[PDB]
């Protein structure tokens, strides 16, 4: 079973940390990659209510399981705070123009 579902993608608790790691670290670093400049501030125009606090980044995760070092970041994000904690796993799949849905 997948403990997070976004469309079709199917991901495991493993590969969420993995990406968010990752993510953290360039954030650390004040690095970004790809045309998108991942990480970056991700404000929650959605307004999910996270359980953790602001502010937000996203991060992609990858469904072949590798970790995102450029090219083309897909639809689905791992959502981290500033304490390196994750918000939510969140997708534009089945979700109208560059809107966000959570991933089940
Ligand atoms: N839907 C959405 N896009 C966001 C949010 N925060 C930042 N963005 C960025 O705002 C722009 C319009 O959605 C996009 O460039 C998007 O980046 P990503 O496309 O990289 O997610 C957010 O909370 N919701
Ligand atoms: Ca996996």
């Given amino acids: 079973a997948c403990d997070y579902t976004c469309g079709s993608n199917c991901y495991s608790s493993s590969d969420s940390s993995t990406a968010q790691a990752a ?6 670093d004040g690095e970004t990659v790809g045309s998108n400049s991942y990480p970056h ?4 125009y959605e307004g999910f209510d996270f359980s953790v606090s602001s502010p937000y980044y996203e991060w992609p995760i990858l469904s072949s399981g590798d970790v995102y070092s450029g090219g083309s970041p897909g ?3 791992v959502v981290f705070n500033e304490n390196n904690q994750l918000a939510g796993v969140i997708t534009h799949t ?3 123009g560059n809107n966000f849905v959570e991933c089940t």
């Fill in 75 to 77: 639809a689905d994000r």
């Fill in 94 to 96: 089945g979700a109208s």
């Fill in 41 to 44: 501030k991700y404000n929650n």
């Fill in 23 to 28: 993510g953290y670290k360039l954030h650390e």
